[PDB]
């Protein structure tokens, strides 16, 4: 059976630091999308990777969280720290 959802969740391990950097956010009015990702860190290892564009931060929307918001949320944010990422890509060839 097929199914859409549209978006997977993450779980980081902790505690801090994470080893993932972010950008945009409500301050930018743009999603929390990861700029670097620490190799051989938490976060890969979970499955966090550059350019996941963050729903949501432990169930939380993300869609309006600050720069400073989604850091603090995540910062405050227990291990595993739950992450949805927004995962919308298509097949192409050419």
Same mark, same amino acid.
């Given at each position: 059976? &097929?199914?859409?959802? &549209?978006? $997977?969740?993450?779980?980081?391990?902790?505690?801090?630091?994470?080893?993932?950097?972010?950008?945009?956010?409500?301050?930018?009015?743009?999603?929390?999308?990861?700029?670097?990702?620490?190799?051989?860190?938490?976060?890969?290892?979970?499955?966090?990777?550059?350019?996941?564009?963050?729903?949501?931060?432990?169930? #939380?929307?993300?869609?309006?969280? $600050?720069?400073?918001?989604? #850091?603090?949320?995540?910062?405050?944010?227990?291990?595993?720290?739950?992450? #949805?990422?927004?995962?919308?890509?298509?097949?192409?060839?050419?």
């Amino acid at each position: 059976g &097929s199914s859409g959802s &549209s978006g $997977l969740t993450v779980d980081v391990a902790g505690p801090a630091p994470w080893g993932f950097r972010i950008s945009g956010g409500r301050d930018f009015h743009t999603p929390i999308i990861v700029t670097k990702v620490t190799e051989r860190g938490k976060a890969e290892a979970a499955d966090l990777r550059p350019g996941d564009i963050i729903v949501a931060i432990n169930g #939380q929307s993300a869609e309006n969280m $600050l720069h400073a918001e989604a #850091q603090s949320k995540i910062r405050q944010s227990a291990s595993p720290l739950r992450l #949805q990422l927004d995962r919308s890509s298509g097949p192409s060839s050419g």
